[PDB]
């Protein structure tokens, strides 16, 4: 096939040194089993102040006051809105606001786009690349709403102390400055391992090898919300008839994230109809709270 690109990646470009030792790809999972596996083995938590070197004087007082779980959520109904241009002229704005909590990505604005993407922002998941390279992040007031979470690609299952020395993007200083400016706004840092714990499951069930790069923010977001909501609506992750190669706002596929396989997994767990995906690009997945495992 054309997956030679992946194997080529392993022989001389394994940037994250991924060494998958789990059940070879292709493991068949019923919907409920996959849901439990995802629930028990993808530990979605934030870096705590007891995690060295965040327990040192340099990081003293900089991490959020209260625990992530005992502050954010839970909620009954939630929505995950991708930044896909497929949302332009979707009119999903209303529907989207009709949820308890909403999670958006990076700099996705709501101003002037409400009718399509909604006007609410409960949680905001951002890449370390954004917070590091975007000066507007320290000024634009859109980052002031809701809760913020930033994540940074790390070496395969690297320990926090190990990751900390070799961050993909060094965003620590910018993270600090922001905290001072907005001391009351909860701003967490995803644990370095959670992306890889999720990656491991995606690989476990995929037909074959997947890109040795972490899951996209989209996939991480869907996961985060599943541990916080009873129900989760995902808009335009699984593309609709309005599929396009740009964001709904002027700054979009790639060859980094194992996007294809993340999509197949969400499709497997989708409780919605094919029509709603085609017309609305809407998928509905159950959260973890009430499942039996
Ligand atoms: C998940 O991460 C948190 C934060 O470090 C940790 O305290 C908890 O025990 C972890 N859960 C598992 C099962 O590894
Ligand atoms: C922080 O944690 C590390 C390892 O867990 C420990 O060795 C160090 O002394 C701790 N710092 C303080 C002052 O608690």
Q: Could you characterize what this model shows?
A:
It catalyses: a beta-D-galactoside + CMP-N-acetyl-beta-neuraminate = an N-acetyl-alpha-neuraminyl-(2->6)-beta-D-galactosyl derivative + CMP + H(+). Keywords: Disulfide bond, Glycoprotein, Glycosyltransferase, Golgi apparatus, Membrane, Phosphoprotein, Secreted, Signal-anchor, Transferase, Transmembrane, Transmembrane helix. There is one protein chain. This protein has helices spanning 4-12, 31-41, 93-97, 114-117, 128-133, 160-165, 172-181, 194-205, 217-226, 259-269, 274-279; strands at 75-81, 101-105, 123-127, 147-151, 187-189, 229-235, 282-286. It is α/β, with parallel strands linked by helices. The chain has a single domain (1-293), classed as sialyltransferase cstii, chain A (Alpha-Beta Complex). Strands 5-4-3-2-1-6-7 form a 7-stranded mixed sheet. Helix 4 links the parallel strand 2 and strand 3. The radius of gyration is 19 Å and the shape is globular. The site of one 2-acetamido-2-deoxy-beta-D-glucopyranose (NAG) has 4 residues, from loops.
CATH fold assignment: sialyltransferase cstii, chain A
Helical residue percent band: 25-40%
Radius of gyration: 19 Å
Write down the domain tally. Answer: 1
N-to-C SSE series? HHEHEHEHEHHEHHEHHE
Q: Give the C-level CATH assignment.
A: Alpha Beta
Corresponding CATH superfamily: Glycosyl transferase family 29
Shape, per Cα inertia axes: globular
- What spatial order of strands do you see in the largest sheet? 5-4-3-2-1-6-7
Tell how many strands the DSSP assignment holds: 7
- What is the second-level CATH architecture? Alpha-Beta Complex
β content, as a range? 5-15%
| Distance from first to last alpha carbon | 38 Å
Query: How would you sum up the major sheet?
Result: 7 strands, mixed
Bound molecules: 2-acetamido-2-deoxy-beta-D-glucopyranose
By DSSP (H or I, 4+ residues per run), the number of helices equals 11
Quaternary organization = monomer
Task: Classify the secondary structure makeup into a structural class.
Answer: alpha/beta
Modified residues (Phosphotyrosine): 256
Catalytic activity: a beta-D-galactoside + CMP-N-acetyl-beta-neuraminate = an N-acetyl-alpha-neuraminyl-(2->6)-beta-D-galactosyl derivative + CMP + H(+)
Lumenal side: 1-293
Subcellular location: Golgi apparatus, Golgi stack membrane; Secreted
